[PDB]
């Protein structure tokens, strides 16, 4: 069915879905830092990251835009999911930490 937008104020909190329910977290990125929105661990939930230049230019530096989470209960269970705002190519002790608590029945 369709799926249901997450944002900071879902941040540490737990969500009950059913398996195969999808939902989507919508947070915006900065250029400043050319950080993105990663999940870096998932209790065997699955996560894909999609870029989304919401009313900006993709590809042009000094836009901004915003970064897609889609999450998939893919198994019966609470699982905690670890999103992190960062950069493959510039760590940052100042990473932004985004947990999500997926209830799947």
């Known amino acids: 069915g369709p799926h249901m937008s997450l944002t900071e104020d879902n941040n540490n909190t737990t969500i009950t879905i059913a398996k195969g ?19 870096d661990s998932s209790e065997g939930l699955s996560n894909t990251v999609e870029y989304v230049a919401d009313q900006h230019a993709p590809g042009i530096s000094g836009s901004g835009g915003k970064y897609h989470i889609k999450i998939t209960g893919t198994q019966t269970g609470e699982g905690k999911i670890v999103l992190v705002y960062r950069r493959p190519w510039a760590p940052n002790a ?12």
């Not at 329910?21 to 999940?39: A, C, D, F, Q, R």
């Not at 100042?94 to 029945?105: E, G």
């Open 21 to 39: 329910e999808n939902k989507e977290i919508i947070l915006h990125g900065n250029p400043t830092t050319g950080y993105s929105w990663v999940v």
């Open 94 to 105: 100042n990473d932004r930490t985004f947990t999500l608590k997926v209830n799947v029945q």
